[PDB]
Design a protein around this ligand. Structure first.
Ligand SMILES: COc1cc(O)c2c(c1C(=O)NCc1cc(CCCC(=O)O)cc3ccccc13)OC1=CC(O)=C(C(C)=O)C(=O)[C@]12C
Lengths: 11, 261
């Protein structure tokens, strides 16, 4: 999961 | 080389400034009146809360405030994530470990930084444009009152340490780079980064707080305290999300909390 955290991290 | 350690402390401090709008220094300027700006709107009861909605915001009161707290937490997680990526070595770690480090670290960081915005009477909210009293927050019908008060308890004690934003920048980085978080895949590179951050912190406290030789050791203890207070926070959250029918938890918080064994 952690799709939002992944987004923020590769942002 | 100390110069390397001091340049690292400085780099983290500069990143901290860019990532966190309202610093402890700016928080204190507002709380002391040093700033001639418009004082923050004081919310002390249900009535004042209603009056200041348009000044703090760009269902019952208890749930209303709990919701607001979540929105700030969501925003803080984004600022903290941005600060994390500025920590040397962080973005070069395995992506899955970056997420894990954030999952377990953000709230300990939120507790730490909330202290910068609080005093014994209340907490600054909405970038210092509002000030909600501790008494109003702890009076909230249970289990919400007990949800708020613990943050203040920690802050009063943590603030007695008198850290400044420069100390905080490193303290926060050390916490984020904890190599003992559940589920980490490549611990060694994380521990290598943290060991260097720890040296930087120790030097920082020695130069910035020569009169308090025990500060480094005390902060290491606060790190362990934060985990305990977090576990209790998580538990306290579990009960609320299952006893309060109308409790929408923000998607980001769900992500963070899901499977936080
Ligand atoms: C008393 O706190 C607040 C009250 C409050 O009314 C608001 C707060 C906070 C706030 O800054 N929250 C920080 C905070 C967060 C958490 C974490 C709880 C959620 C979680 O991370 O699991 C626990 C706390 C305990 C004591 C004091 C502040 C705490 O921040 C807000 C964000 C919004 O978008 C709001 C809107 C648009 O309605 C609010 O309504 C605000 C203006």
């Amino acid at each position: 999961r952690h799709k939002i955290l992944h987004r923020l991290l590769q942002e | 080389e100390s110069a390397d350690l001091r340049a690292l402390a400085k780099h983290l401090y500069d990143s901290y400034i860019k990532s966190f709008p309202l610093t402890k220094a700016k928080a204190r300027a507002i709380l002391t009146g040093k700033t001639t700006d418009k004082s923050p709107f004081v919310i002390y009861d249900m009535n004042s809360l209603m009056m200041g909605e348009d000044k703090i915001k760009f269902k019952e009161v208890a749930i209303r405030i709990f919701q607001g707290c979540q929105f700030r937490s969501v925003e803080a997680v984004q600022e903290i994530t941005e600060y994390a990526k500025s920590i040397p070595g962080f973005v070069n770690l395995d992506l899955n470990d970056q997420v894990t480090l954030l999952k377990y670290g953000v709230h300990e960081i939120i507790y730490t930084m909330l202290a910068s915005l609080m005093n014994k009477d209340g907490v600054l909210i909405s970038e210092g444009q509002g000030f909600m009293t501790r008494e109003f927050l702890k009076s909230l019908r249970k289990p919400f009152g007990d949800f708020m008060e613990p943050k203040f308890e920690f802050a009063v004690k943590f603030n007695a340490l008198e850290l400044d934003d420069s100390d905080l920048a490193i303290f926060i980085a050390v916490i984020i780079l904890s190599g003992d978080r559940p589920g980490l895949l490549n611990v060694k590179p994380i521990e290598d980064i943290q060991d260097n951050l720890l040296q930087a912190l120790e030097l920082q406290l020695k130069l910035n707080h020569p009169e308090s030789s025990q500060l480094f050791a005390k902060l290491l203890q606060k790190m362990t305290d934060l985990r305990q207070i977090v576990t209790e926070h998580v538990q306290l959250l579990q009960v609320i999300k299952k006893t309060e029918t109308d409790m929408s938890l923000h998607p980001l918080l769900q992500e963070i909390y899901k499977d936080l064994y």
